[PDB]
DNA sequence: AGGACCC
DNA sequence: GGGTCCT
């Protein structure tokens, strides 16, 4: 099992789609989904009118005064539809990895091979692509890698069709030989379109990026380190001294990020299955005095309990997260956790009680249940 | 507990 | 306003 066919599915303006489906009157109006002072996402009509993702509400409403806004602080419906998407994809092939609420990877390698064994040495030359070919690259029908990726594009088109027919949702897909490249290529044509990457255009796709932060896997901190070292482009990263990179980022981060800079990524698509943790949050800048705010911890709990119940499995740990404030230097939240007594596993008041103590041990209040069994 | 990453 | 896995 060497060469892979991977699809990355990435839905369009996910919370906005869900809001437009719920309230048809919002369809073909420019629409922003708001959380506190942020317009976290907006539909493609708003993006034509200036509105950007994670743009603050003011900038957004003076870029576009008629922008309609709906509150998206409660994730219940987005989370529900998100699992519907994953389950539908799992029906195509069972190893589906989630990334956030609206991206999924599927390893289609077995499915592609089974479809190939089913065509004769006649219709093999009838194989055609579905959707865009990255960089308008010519297909070579005698290249077995090209043929597999095209069958991969046909499977992806069937996935996007089923999503739309069964769930009312549109999205993009990217088909490529690994997860890094499938995820880079899925965003090439948006919204609601798909693209496949043939191997000869891999360097073109990688060099299309304008900074190494654009590479999935390289974040805020790593990008700052590389900068400090004079590394700005993908090519700077590709040509940089492996030794020097090793003894600066650790052998782990360094060998992996350098491979990514070439388009190389051996990481497997992992079956996400059910979630590992369940949390709810609330934000209020300045607002929590450190006493008159327990009632908040009680709401978070009431709502979580219903979710964790419905799941069918139970958590064996609970955690309280907080954020403090005086100025905005970089990062730092705070957590205390402890196990959940097993009497209480099998509800409110004793949980309120455990939490009010983890509080006393210690803007933001969140509760997180984890260590599910 | 907290770090880095992700959407 | 959520999530993942590693140290
Ligand atoms: N609060 C918050 N929500 C986010 C953040 N990133 C993503 N989300 C939510 C809003 C999105 O609708 C959903 C999926 O994230 P994506 O990056 O795919 O953006 P979205 O689908 O809206 O846009 P797209 O059409 O994919 O460009 O997750 C973030 O940094 N903060
Ligand atoms: Mg995305
Ligand atoms: Mg999306």
Chain C nucleotides close to protein (CB under 7 A) are 1-7
Indicate yes or no: strand B within 7 A of the C-beta of A219: yes
Nearest partner of A148 among A117, A188, A171, A169, judged by Cα: A117
| Contact present, A35 and A18 (Cβ < 8 Å) | no
| Contact present, A206 and A135 (Cβ < 8 Å) | no
Scanning every strand, the nucleotide with its C1' closest to A338's CA turns out to be B1
> Of the bound ligands, which one is closest to the alpha carbon of residue A11?
3
- Alpha-carbon gap, residue A253 to A233, rounded angstroms: 17
- Alpha-carbon gap, residue A197 to A180, rounded angstroms: 11
Q: For residue A161, give both structure tokens.
A: 């069709």
b/e map of A114-140 (b: 16 or more CB within 10 Å)?
Answer: ebeeeeeeeeeeebebbbbbbbeeeee
CA–CA distances in Å: residue A197 to residues A14, A75, A157: 24, 34, 15
Helix axes A220-228, A242-261, angle to 10 degrees: 130
Indicate yes or no: strand B within 7 A of the C-beta of A100: yes
| Contact present, A230 and A166 (Cβ < 8 Å) | no
* Dihedral in degrees, nearest 10, Cα atoms A295, A296, A301, A304: 150
- Alpha-carbon gap, residue A44 to A53, rounded angstroms: 11
Please tell me the distance between residue A241's alpha carbon and the centre of ligand 2 in angstroms: 32
Please report the domains of chain A, with CATH numbers, ordered by start residue. 1-12+75-197 (3.30.70.270), 13-74 (3.40.1170.60), 198-274 (1.10.150.20), 275-373 (3.30.1490.100)
Strand A132-133 and strand A171-176: the pairing is unpaired
Measured in degrees and rounded to the nearest 5, phi and psi for residue A258 equal -70, -40
Nearest partner of A124 among A140, A108, A101, A104, judged by Cα: A140
Scanning every strand, the nucleotide with its C1' closest to A216's CA turns out to be B6
Annotated binding site of A: 10-11, 15, 47, 102
Ligand 1 contact via A14 beta carbon (within 6 Å): yes
CA–CA distances in Å: residue A237 to residues A46, A231, A248, A303: 36, 6, 13, 46
Residue A322, number of CB atoms within 10 A of its CB: 17
Q: Hey, which of A8, A33, A40 would you mutate to test ligand 1's pocket, going by the most ligand atoms within 8 Å of its Cβ?
A: A40
Residue A207, number of CB atoms within 10 A of its CB: 13
Q: For residue A340, give both structure tokens.
A: 């959940």
Name the residues around ion ligand 2, CB cutoff 5 A: A 10
- Alpha-carbon gap, residue A89 to A191, rounded angstroms: 19
Query: Could you tell me the distance in Å between the CA of residue A99 and the C1' of nucleotide B7?
Result: 6
CA–CA distances in Å: residue A7 to residues A104, A108, A153, A183: 8, 7, 8, 8
Could you tell me how many residues make up chain A? 373
Instruction: Measure CA A198 to chain center.
Output: 24
Indicate yes or no: strand B within 7 A of the C-beta of A218: yes
Please tell me the distance between residue A15's alpha carbon and the centre of ligand 1 in angstroms: 8
Method: X-ray
């Amino acid at each position: 099992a060497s060469s892979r066919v991977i699809v990355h599915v990435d839905l369009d303006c996910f919370y906005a789609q869900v809001e437009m489906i719920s309230n048809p009157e919002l369809k073909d109006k420019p629409l922003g989904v708001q959380q506190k002072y942020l317009v976290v996402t907006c539909n493609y009509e708003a993006r034509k009118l200036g509105v950007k993702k994670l743009m603050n509400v003011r900038d957004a409403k003076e870029k576009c005064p008629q922008l309609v806004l709906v509150n998206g602080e409660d994730l219940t419906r987005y989370r529900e539809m998100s699992y519907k998407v994953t389950e539908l994809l799992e029906e195509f092939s069972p190893v589906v990895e989630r990334l956030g609420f609206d991206e999924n990877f599927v390893d289609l390698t077995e499915m592609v091979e089974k479809r190939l064994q089913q065509l004769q040495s006649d219709e093999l030359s009838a194989v055609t692509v579905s959707g865009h070919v990255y960089n308008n690259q010519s297909i070579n029908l005698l290249d077995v890698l090209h043929i597999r990726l095209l069958v991969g594009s046909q499977i992806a088109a069937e996935m996007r069709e089923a999503m739309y027919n069964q769930l009312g949702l549109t999205g993009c897909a990217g088909v490529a030989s690994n997860k890094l490249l499938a995820k880079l290529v899925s965003g090439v044509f948006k919204p609601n379109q798909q693209t496949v990457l043939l191997p000869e255009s891999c360097q073109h796709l990688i060099h299309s990026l304008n900074h190494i932060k654009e590479i999935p896997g390289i974040g805020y901190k790593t990008a700052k380190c590389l900068e400090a070292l004079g590394i700005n482009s993908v090519r700077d990263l590709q040509t940089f001294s492996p030794k020097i990179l090793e003894k600066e980022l650790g052998i782990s981060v360094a060998q992996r990020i350098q491979k990514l800079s070439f388009g190389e990524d051996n990481s497997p698509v992992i079956l996400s299955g059910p979630p590992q943790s369940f949390s709810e949050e609330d934000s209020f800048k300045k607002c929590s005095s450190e006493v008159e705010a327990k009632n908040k911890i009680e709401e978070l709990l009431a709502s979580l309990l219903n979710r964790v119940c419905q799941d069918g499995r139970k958590p064996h740990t609970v955690r309280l997260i907080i954020r403090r404030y005086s100025s905005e230097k970089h990062y730092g939240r705070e957590s205390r956790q402890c196990p959940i007594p097993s009497h209480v596993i099998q509800v409110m008041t004793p949980m309120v009680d455990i939490l009010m103590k983890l509080f006393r041990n210690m803007t933001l209040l969140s509760v997180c249940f984890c260590n599910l069994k």
